[PDB]
Design a protein around this motif. Structure first.
Motif, PDB file in Angstrom:
ATOM      1  N   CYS A 193      11.966  -5.107   6.501  1.00  0.00           N
ATOM      2  CA  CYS A 193      11.697  -4.066   5.456  1.00  0.00           C
ATOM      3  C   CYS A 193      10.703  -3.272   6.025  1.00  0.00           C
ATOM      4  O   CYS A 193      10.062  -3.164   7.169  1.00  0.00           O
ATOM      5  CB  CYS A 193      11.141  -4.897   3.935  1.00  0.00           C
ATOM      6  N   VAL A 194      10.681  -2.153   5.294  1.00  0.00           N
ATOM      7  CA  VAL A 194       9.861  -0.772   5.539  1.00  0.00           C
ATOM      8  C   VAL A 194       9.200  -0.347   4.395  1.00  0.00           C
ATOM      9  O   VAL A 194       9.378  -0.149   3.262  1.00  0.00           O
ATOM     10  CB  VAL A 194      10.407   0.021   6.286  1.00  0.00           C
ATOM     11  N   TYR A 195       7.728  -0.215   4.593  1.00  0.00           N
ATOM     12  CA  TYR A 195       6.872   0.304   3.661  1.00  0.00           C
ATOM     13  C   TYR A 195       6.850   1.867   3.927  1.00  0.00           C
ATOM     14  O   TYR A 195       6.244   2.229   4.923  1.00  0.00           O
ATOM     15  CB  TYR A 195       5.596  -0.335   3.309  1.00  0.00           C
ATOM     16  N   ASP A 196       7.431   2.813   3.225  1.00  0.00           N
ATOM     17  CA  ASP A 196       7.314   4.265   3.487  1.00  0.00           C
ATOM     18  C   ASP A 196       6.245   4.858   2.852  1.00  0.00           C
ATOM     19  O   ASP A 196       6.208   5.465   1.465  1.00  0.00           O
ATOM     20  CB  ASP A 196       8.691   4.797   2.986  1.00  0.00           C
ATOM     21  N   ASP A 197       4.946   4.834   3.652  1.00  0.00           N
ATOM     22  CA  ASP A 197       3.622   5.238   3.077  1.00  0.00           C
ATOM     23  C   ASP A 197       3.520   6.832   3.595  1.00  0.00           C
ATOM     24  O   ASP A 197       2.401   7.332   3.538  1.00  0.00           O
ATOM     25  CB  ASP A 197       2.731   4.274   3.415  1.00  0.00           C
ATOM     26  N   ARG A 198       4.505   7.386   4.032  1.00  0.00           N
ATOM     27  CA  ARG A 198       4.334   8.929   4.472  1.00  0.00           C
ATOM     28  C   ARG A 198       3.903   9.622   3.415  1.00  0.00           C
ATOM     29  O   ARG A 198       4.196   9.901   2.396  1.00  0.00           O
ATOM     30  CB  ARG A 198       5.514   9.187   4.834  1.00  0.00           C
ATOM     31  N   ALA A 199       2.527  10.269   3.984  1.00  0.00           N
ATOM     32  CA  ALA A 199       1.619  11.021   2.958  1.00  0.00           C
ATOM     33  C   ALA A 199       2.311  12.439   2.353  1.00  0.00           C
ATOM     34  O   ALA A 199       2.274  12.665   1.238  1.00  0.00           O
ATOM     35  CB  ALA A 199       0.420  11.421   3.295  1.00  0.00           C
ATOM     36  N   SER A 200       3.179  13.182   3.225  1.00  0.00           N
ATOM     37  CA  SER A 200       3.550  14.480   3.074  1.00  0.00           C
ATOM     38  C   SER A 200       4.988  14.434   2.301  1.00  0.00           C
ATOM     39  O   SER A 200       5.320  15.697   2.246  1.00  0.00           O
ATOM     40  CB  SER A 200       3.603  14.969   4.474  1.00  0.00           C
ATOM     41  N   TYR A 201       5.351  13.429   1.831  1.00  0.00           N
ATOM     42  CA  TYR A 201       6.779  13.383   1.128  1.00  0.00           C
ATOM     43  C   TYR A 201       6.451  12.759  -0.118  1.00  0.00           C
ATOM     44  O   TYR A 201       6.047  11.854  -0.160  1.00  0.00           O
ATOM     45  CB  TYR A 201       7.841  12.863   1.786  1.00  0.00           C
ATOM     46  N   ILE A 245      -2.287   1.165  -5.027  1.00  0.00           N
ATOM     47  CA  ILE A 245      -1.053   1.135  -4.687  1.00  0.00           C
ATOM     48  C   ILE A 245      -0.611   0.724  -3.387  1.00  0.00           C
ATOM     49  O   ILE A 245       0.109  -0.417  -3.011  1.00  0.00           O
ATOM     50  CB  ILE A 245      -0.508   2.489  -4.950  1.00  0.00           C
ATOM     51  N   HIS A 246      -1.359   1.313  -2.135  1.00  0.00           N
ATOM     52  CA  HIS A 246      -1.135   0.954  -0.850  1.00  0.00           C
ATOM     53  C   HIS A 246      -1.098  -0.684  -0.662  1.00  0.00           C
ATOM     54  O   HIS A 246      -0.414  -1.408  -0.050  1.00  0.00           O
ATOM     55  CB  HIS A 246      -2.133   1.552  -0.097  1.00  0.00           C
ATOM     56  N   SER A 247      -2.349  -1.277  -1.175  1.00  0.00           N
ATOM     57  CA  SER A 247      -2.573  -2.628  -1.007  1.00  0.00           C
ATOM     58  C   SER A 247      -1.627  -3.468  -1.798  1.00  0.00           C
ATOM     59  O   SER A 247      -1.452  -4.418  -1.086  1.00  0.00           O
ATOM     60  CB  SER A 247      -4.141  -2.779  -1.680  1.00  0.00           C
ATOM     61  N   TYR A 248      -1.012  -3.024  -2.663  1.00  0.00           N
ATOM     62  CA  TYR A 248      -0.250  -3.725  -3.550  1.00  0.00           C
ATOM     63  C   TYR A 248       1.317  -3.654  -2.796  1.00  0.00           C
ATOM     64  O   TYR A 248       1.868  -4.617  -2.675  1.00  0.00           O
ATOM     65  CB  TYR A 248       0.119  -3.083  -4.968  1.00  0.00           C
ATOM     66  N   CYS A 249       1.733  -2.659  -2.326  1.00  0.00           N
ATOM     67  CA  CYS A 249       3.023  -2.432  -1.471  1.00  0.00           C
ATOM     68  C   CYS A 249       2.959  -3.170  -0.275  1.00  0.00           C
ATOM     69  O   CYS A 249       3.989  -3.956   0.014  1.00  0.00           O
ATOM     70  CB  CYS A 249       3.160  -0.853  -1.425  1.00  0.00           C
ATOM     71  N   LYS A 250       1.868  -3.376   0.539  1.00  0.00           N
ATOM     72  CA  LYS A 250       1.578  -4.134   1.608  1.00  0.00           C
ATOM     73  C   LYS A 250       1.743  -5.478   1.213  1.00  0.00           C
ATOM     74  O   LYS A 250       2.144  -6.496   2.213  1.00  0.00           O
ATOM     75  CB  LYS A 250       0.437  -4.033   2.460  1.00  0.00           C
ATOM     76  N   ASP A 251       1.376  -5.854   0.074  1.00  0.00           N
ATOM     77  CA  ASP A 251       1.372  -7.276  -0.364  1.00  0.00           C
ATOM     78  C   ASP A 251       2.831  -7.716  -0.224  1.00  0.00           C
ATOM     79  O   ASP A 251       3.251  -8.751   0.185  1.00  0.00           O
ATOM     80  CB  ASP A 251       0.541  -7.579  -1.590  1.00  0.00           C
ATOM     81  N   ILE A 252       3.477  -6.749  -1.092  1.00  0.00           N
ATOM     82  CA  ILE A 252       4.996  -7.144  -1.233  1.00  0.00           C
ATOM     83  C   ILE A 252       5.562  -6.991   0.327  1.00  0.00           C
ATOM     84  O   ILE A 252       6.504  -7.823   0.427  1.00  0.00           O
ATOM     85  CB  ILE A 252       5.761  -6.083  -2.087  1.00  0.00           C
ATOM     86  N   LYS A 297       4.509  -8.117   3.022  1.00  0.00           N
ATOM     87  CA  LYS A 297       3.938  -9.429   3.719  1.00  0.00           C
ATOM     88  C   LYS A 297       4.802 -10.484   2.997  1.00  0.00           C
ATOM     89  O   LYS A 297       5.024 -11.367   3.679  1.00  0.00           O
ATOM     90  CB  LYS A 297       2.454  -9.684   3.627  1.00  0.00           C
ATOM     91  N   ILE A 298       4.896 -10.446   1.768  1.00  0.00           N
ATOM     92  CA  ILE A 298       5.996 -11.434   1.077  1.00  0.00           C
ATOM     93  C   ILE A 298       7.243 -11.579   1.624  1.00  0.00           C
ATOM     94  O   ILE A 298       7.701 -12.633   1.876  1.00  0.00           O
ATOM     95  CB  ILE A 298       5.742 -11.427  -0.273  1.00  0.00           C
ATOM     96  N   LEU A 299       7.788 -10.401   1.866  1.00  0.00           N
ATOM     97  CA  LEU A 299       9.304 -10.326   2.373  1.00  0.00           C
ATOM     98  C   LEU A 299       9.255 -10.643   4.032  1.00  0.00           C
ATOM     99  O   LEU A 299       9.961 -11.596   4.186  1.00  0.00           O
ATOM    100  CB  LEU A 299       9.759  -8.884   2.204  1.00  0.00           C
ATOM    101  N   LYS A 300       8.343 -10.089   4.719  1.00  0.00           N
ATOM    102  CA  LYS A 300       8.389 -10.325   6.049  1.00  0.00           C
ATOM    103  C   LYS A 300       7.857 -11.627   6.425  1.00  0.00           C
ATOM    104  O   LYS A 300       8.842 -12.427   7.444  1.00  0.00           O
ATOM    105  CB  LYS A 300       7.440  -9.394   6.916  1.00  0.00           C
ATOM    106  N   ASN A 301       7.174 -12.375   5.639  1.00  0.00           N
ATOM    107  CA  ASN A 301       6.955 -13.813   5.806  1.00  0.00           C
ATOM    108  C   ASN A 301       8.292 -14.616   5.646  1.00  0.00           C
ATOM    109  O   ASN A 301       8.392 -15.734   6.538  1.00  0.00           O
ATOM    110  CB  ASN A 301       5.797 -14.252   4.883  1.00  0.00           C
ATOM    111  N   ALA A 302       8.934 -14.279   4.786  1.00  0.00           N
ATOM    112  CA  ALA A 302      10.156 -14.896   4.385  1.00  0.00           C
ATOM    113  C   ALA A 302      11.309 -14.642   5.341  1.00  0.00           C
ATOM    114  O   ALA A 302      12.569 -14.813   5.008  1.00  0.00           O
ATOM    115  CB  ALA A 302      10.671 -14.692   2.905  1.00  0.00           C
ATOM    116  N   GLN A 303      11.032 -13.753   6.182  1.00  0.00           N
ATOM    117  CA  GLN A 303      12.029 -13.217   7.361  1.00  0.00           C
ATOM    118  C   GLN A 303      13.030 -12.221   6.737  1.00  0.00           C
ATOM    119  O   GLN A 303      14.122 -12.152   7.313  1.00  0.00           O
ATOM    120  CB  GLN A 303      12.862 -14.326   8.074  1.00  0.00           C
ATOM    121  N   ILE A 304      12.635 -11.497   5.884  1.00  0.00           N
ATOM    122  CA  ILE A 304      13.509 -10.377   5.284  1.00  0.00           C
ATOM    123  C   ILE A 304      12.708  -9.085   5.826  1.00  0.00           C
ATOM    124  O   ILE A 304      11.789  -8.559   5.311  1.00  0.00           O
ATOM    125  CB  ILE A 304      13.446 -10.391   3.697  1.00  0.00           C
TER     126      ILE A 304
END
Ligand code: 9X2
Ligand code: PRO
Length: 486
Positions: A318-326, A300-307, A309-316
């Motif tokens: 974004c934030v990946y909320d990977d906080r473990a405790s919530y 899951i982590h690896s997939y969300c980080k792929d997404i 990077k796709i957005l940030k490379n296109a200058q969009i």
């Protein structure tokens, strides 16, 4: 629930608004009444509209500048006075002479305009400032909308004749239309202020008016004044024209404040909290992982980080909320409250299908998108969210106007949270009369029940041949919008 908005926008507007601005991290309260802290999410919006307006006024040859925060009695007197704050002391020692904090900078700037303008060659003069001003009123403050200190821009120009100045007045007014429409997704109504409501010293005041349909209140969104030669006479701003004749300059001034952010919030906010047009949101997308007890989290982590990077490379951004405790549900609410335009959900069922769920903040519609289609679907959805926010707001604005011919129809429309378009003789005397009587007949909020003249719209219906003024019975001149207001 308990961490969300617990007052409904339609039921308790005032408490809804307070919760939204605090829990979305826009505003922090302060120990001086009427002064509020703009946290990063709020200031980011200001910077966005600042960058837009700067680019547009540069095309009109307006240049930024900075004038002092303070003005002497001498300059301030050539022209507010109960709301002007005075500095009288440094440390424990009194000042040789008291100085005022600017409520607006006409008298500060025009104190020196005569040195800069001597001949027709020196015109036009076109200046803008991004600054804060102070109006120490004792009316009830409202964060963003009605504050004692506020951020704005104020523009000031001087021209060789009336035609050029008036054209600039209305060019600026349309830039304000665009500021509100293209960045805040807020529709406004252009018009002219009544004589009782125009700016002191102005020949006429044009205005962009907004309306908050949930509590029935108009709000002046921006202003653009034709000052004619009135300030030129007061400050002796003369120039020698091409025929060697001394003439006064024709001046304009215009402003728009952080009230615009408050109008945006009150317009698009809902019972889940803040709703941001993408153009004024730092993060366009938040990616929320769902683990559903898989224990294969690195997939899951690896997939969300792929997404990501796709957005940030296109200058969009974004934030990946990977906080473990919530939990995911906590994260959904967290970013909905903060107004993020789009949430992308990634769980195991999604990983197996090489897709993800994309959820729009404005209407909560969800759809499944293949991973390779995420960039394009995201780009279009951000565009569509803005279009939908604007069109929904535009329909509510259209629906808030009732056209009337007599006063007997007026109080019914106000109590339905409406503005009225009415035929009016425009006599300044009638303005206080209309305010008095509509306030008297109001019997319910903590703001005034008085209806006042909002603006004479630029877009006028036909005035029938014998139509009378809804108030005085005299012949009507034009149609004028009236309403309760902030
Ligand atoms: O006015 C604000 N605060 C004051 C101080 C205070 C403190 C507590 C309670 C209430 C109040 C009111 C205010 N506060 C925050 C953000 N923006 C603001 N103002 C704004 O957006 N305006 C529209 C642009 C201009 C409008 N033009 C005119 O007014 C002229 C004169 C008549 C009509 N034409 C300037 C005013
Ligand atoms: O305060 C006002 O309404 C005008 C326009 C900005 C500068 N002064």
């Amino acid at each position: 629930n308990i961490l969300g908005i617990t007052s409904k926008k339609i039921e308790n507007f005032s408490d809804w608004y307070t919760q939204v601005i605090v829990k979305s991290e826009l505003i922090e309260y302060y120990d001086i009444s009427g002064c509020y802290i703009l946290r990063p999410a709020a200031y980011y919006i200001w910077e966005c509209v600042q960058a837009f307006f700067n680019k547009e006024i540069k095309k009109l040859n307006v240049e930024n500048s900075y004038f002092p925060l303070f003005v002497t009695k001498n300059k301030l007197e050539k022209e507010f006075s109960p709301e002007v704050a005075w500095v009288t002391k440094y440390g424990d020692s009194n000042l040789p002479e008291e100085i005022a904090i600017r409520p607006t900078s006409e008298t500060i700037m025009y104190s020196v305009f005569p040195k800069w303008i001597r001949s027709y060659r020196d015109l036009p003069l076109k200046l803008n400032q991004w600054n804060t001003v102070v109006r120490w009123e004792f009316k009830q403050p409202t964060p963003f909308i009605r504050t004692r200190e506020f951020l704005w821009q104020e523009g000031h120009t001087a021209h060789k004749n009336e035609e050029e100045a008036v054209k600039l007045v209305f060019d600026i007014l349309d830039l304000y239309r665009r500021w509100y429409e293209e960045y805040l997704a807020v529709p406004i109504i252009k018009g002219i202020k009544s004589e009782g409501e125009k700016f002191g010293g102005a020949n006429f005041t044009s205005t962009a008016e907004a309306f908050i349909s949930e509590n029935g209140r108009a709000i002046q969104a921006a202003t653009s004044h034709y000052l004619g030669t009135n300030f030129a006479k007061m400050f002796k701003i003369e120039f020698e024209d091409e025929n060697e004749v001394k003439q006064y300059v024709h001046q304009t001034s215009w402003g728009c404040t952080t009230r615009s952010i408050g109008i945006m919030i009150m317009t698009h906010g809902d019972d889940k909290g803040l709703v941001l047009p993408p153009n004024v949101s730092k993060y366009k997308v938040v990616i929320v992982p769902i683990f559903y007890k898989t224990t294969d989290e690195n997939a899951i982590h690896s997939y969300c980080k792929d997404i990501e990077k796709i957005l940030k490379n296109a200058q969009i951004n974004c934030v990946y909320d990977d906080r473990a405790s919530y939990s995911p549900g906590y994260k959904f609410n967290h970013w909905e409250l903060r107004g993020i335009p789009i949430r992308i959900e990634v769980g195991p069922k999604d990983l197996q299908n090489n897709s993800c769920v994309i959820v729009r903040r404005d209407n909560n519609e969800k759809c499944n998108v293949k991973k390779e289609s995420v960039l394009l679907e995201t780009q279009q959805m951000l565009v569509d969210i803005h279009k939908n926010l604007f069109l929904k707001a535009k329909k509510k604005l259209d629906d808030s106007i009732v056209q009337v011919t007599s006063f007997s129809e007026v109080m019914n429309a106000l109590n339905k949270k409406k503005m009225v378009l009415a035929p009016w003789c425009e006599d300044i005397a009638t303005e206080e009369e209309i305010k008095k009587e509509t306030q008297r007949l109001s019997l319910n909020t903590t703001l005034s029940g008085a209806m006042k003249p909002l603006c004479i719209p630029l877009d006028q219906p036909p005035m029938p041949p014998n139509m009378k003024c809804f108030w005085s019975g005299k012949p009507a001149k034009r149609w004028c919008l009236f309403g309760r207001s902030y």
